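ok so heres the complex, five chains, lmk if somethin looks off
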Amino acid sequence: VQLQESGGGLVQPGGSLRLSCAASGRTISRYAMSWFRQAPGKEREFVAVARRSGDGAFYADSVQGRFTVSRDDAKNTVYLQMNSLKPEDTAVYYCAIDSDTFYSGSYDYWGQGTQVTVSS
Amino acid sequence: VQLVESGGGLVQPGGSLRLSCAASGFNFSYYSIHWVRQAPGKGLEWVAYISSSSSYTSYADSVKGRFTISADTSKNTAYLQMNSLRAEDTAVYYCARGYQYWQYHASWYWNGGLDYWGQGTLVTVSSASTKGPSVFPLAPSGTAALGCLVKDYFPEPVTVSWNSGALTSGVHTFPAVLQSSGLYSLSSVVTVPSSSLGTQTYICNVNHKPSNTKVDKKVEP
Amino acid sequence: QRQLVESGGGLVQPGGSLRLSCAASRSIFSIDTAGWFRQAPGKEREGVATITRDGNANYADSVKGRFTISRDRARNTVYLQMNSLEPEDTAVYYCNAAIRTTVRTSAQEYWGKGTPVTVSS
Amino acid sequence: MSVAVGYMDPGNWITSMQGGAQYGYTLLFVILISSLAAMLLQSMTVRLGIATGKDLAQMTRHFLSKPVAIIFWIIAELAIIATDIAEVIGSAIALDLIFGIPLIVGALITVFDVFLLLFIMRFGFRKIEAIVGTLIFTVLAIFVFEVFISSPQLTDILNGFVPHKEIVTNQGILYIALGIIGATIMPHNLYLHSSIVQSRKYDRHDNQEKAQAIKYATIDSNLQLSIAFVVNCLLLTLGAALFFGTKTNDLGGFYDLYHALKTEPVLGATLGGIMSTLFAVALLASGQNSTITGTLAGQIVMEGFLRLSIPNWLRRLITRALAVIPVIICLIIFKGNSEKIEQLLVFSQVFLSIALPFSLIPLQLATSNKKLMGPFINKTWVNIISWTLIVILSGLNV
Amino acid sequence: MTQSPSSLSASVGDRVTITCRASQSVSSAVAWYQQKPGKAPKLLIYSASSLYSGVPSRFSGSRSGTDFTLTISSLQPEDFATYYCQQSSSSLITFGQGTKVEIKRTVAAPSVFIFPPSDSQLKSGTASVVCLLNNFYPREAKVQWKVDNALQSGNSQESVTEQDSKDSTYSLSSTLTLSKADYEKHKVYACEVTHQGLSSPVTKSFNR
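and the predicted structre for the whole thing:
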């Protein structure tokens, strides 16, 4: 199983990016897919989770309202639409598969991450 | 239209017991009576059905044979007669009005439903006798948690307060769970400031009325 | 109270129409006085119409304009045609009767079992 | 070859049976009298029929002028229409019972169906007449069987004493009374006999001693009317023994008989339906023959009063249509009510008996002039006058 | 009967749908009921499309295919309870397993605490070890007991609170029960917790 994040980059405050996470070796349709982020030196922190279609998306306090997670099951890809970006959002963003279909966060597979830098 | 259940105490396994469903108001010879059961913390489950006469009676496989329904239009009353009670039948039984000819009707485009529900009695099967809890501290080791373990009591309920009701914020008194002994156990916990542990006293006040048990337990760091 | 058999109920969109037909079980001489009752799921058995020996067609006070009781003296069968139905007429529609078996035996009541009628999109 | 004729006409059927469902054995007497009367009247017209080489219609024309001629022509037309309405209702009820089609469709089928009578005419007489005679005779056997334990002296002593208080007071009694009479006389029969006698190989004028023909024909007519009397008496006592002394005093039209035969206990279960459908068939056939007889009568009337003529199919059609209009009017108005239709039927018969005198008077007058005359016309005089009083009283109480 | 969604989360006023898979019964139409905690279930919809006299109009029926559904158009802050579908059959009806709506709220990881047995209890011959998971959301969590690093099975029980009416969280207790003799055979008592809000398991432990 492999995950690959893309879509990061340098973006101005208030601006928008859309991160993508492409999965191979695993059908994502049965699994929740989550986004985490890690600023240097800090702990890797939860951002968002897209559960299976119909089971809802959930978000961290810091990104609620500005970020939206969404899924393309057919293409084994999950997305993080990031609007109204803040300096505080600068981090490496990571995608992870929840291997537990009952949603307990058994994150066995992780991507390598994609850098997001929000500054002018 | 006031359905009323009655007749629920405590039974030894395999025993027998009657349950009374006093009706009122509506002309009783027009409506059926259903007994809908609910285990603790599960979904409802249909158990029996009696019409005006005794010429109509279905049943549910769970109590197929072990249960005898009966009617008496004299006092609009309906009676359930349970025998060979099993350890699992502990439940909260109901009543429910509903159409008389509810079979001849039901089809791919109509379903009468159960209009008026009672309030429920609590049958409970056990071998278990009345017993007050043992109360043990859950000692704390910027928020600390502390508590009391309220163990091996029967029947429900118990109450737990903290500092004689002066401490209410952050208290969680857990739902009791039945142990393999057939006795209940629960913990009551509270989170407090860690900086308070040296200078604030924490006491859980446990009351189990069925056994007249009252215990104050000081919970020390 | 059996040996009467209504028939005809069935799903129908708002404003449709349909004809229920109380009946008899076998070779009944005459139907003195009919009547069609309603028992919607949260109310009491109301009553909707009343024919008499010869003819009276007395109705309720909320239905005049849509419900046309009748009789069929040939094959003893009371009728009830409801027209331009509404979502407040959903209920099971019982039938009453005053059957008299043979030309000299006194009258005798009879109730039906009724049929459902649903109105919705 | 074999015997075949139909004597039961729905008019007399319903009137007699009704007279036995409601009031009992009282009406019985009236029946007899009416029957006797008709005998005499037949006699009279037959005499007029054989001499004077005319038809009662031509007669009327020779005592009137153009306008009053129009009047009496209207009256005779209305008599015919009355009989035809009676018939069409009979046929419609028969159809609704046997098959299940509603009344309006049966009425329409009957009205524009006279082609059956050309078809079956091209088909063959003897067989159809034999079979209808068989079925009618058998239906009458059935009715006879059906009559059960009864008290003779009741029927008798009610036939005899004629409770005048009774026969006149209940203005429900006069109603069915006039019904029975006007259904036992039927003026169209008068005109038709007046005509038909005109051809029996009598030496039209060159035999003053042709009255042998008179005697022979009158013997025949009396036999016929006597058997009609017996049948009517039977139907009446049937209505009596099957609906009297009960609750709600059910009217006793057709439907009620049709059911009472079916649900009849002692007749088993299936035999009920068997006799039921047999009765239905009988009703239908009787209706049809009662129609076919009167076409010639209508033709004779119009030929006499207006001295004009038409082919028959047009005559029958237009008469039947103007007859069926009131049926449909009543049906749609009263939304369908067996009770209401049978009430219309009886009212038709009584209207016939109302119209009678306007065609009875000239008959008497004409037989008072020519060579052959009755010695005691006094019977007919008292008849017409008592008659007039009855009809005018029944009119008045309205 | 198998209701498809089972823990449908939602926020106020929005629209939600709930479906009851016809388990190829006689397929006689459903009749949705509602029940709040510890009370008498009420009627909501009978014959799958009509309302019950005196029930707010937000509700609705639907007979999509052979999958009966219910749709709350707008979610009043009052409607928060378990829902039940009830299909008739030949001669016995049966209620569905039932689903339960709940209040949407941004994920909260549990705070974890461990409590050793008291000396008083031990002196009586039993050791209860308690692990507390406090104020978390959603409800799903796992607690694994390790004793001298050995995973335990069969000797623990859990209780979970009802959702808190103010902060919409749950708390959970897991109690490991050992004989005194078994308790005294081991040193390290640990409760290891996972939850979807935790990036790595949280372990709380003590040394006897």
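quick notes: The CA atoms of residues 2 and 24 of chain A lie 5 Å apart. thats all i got rn
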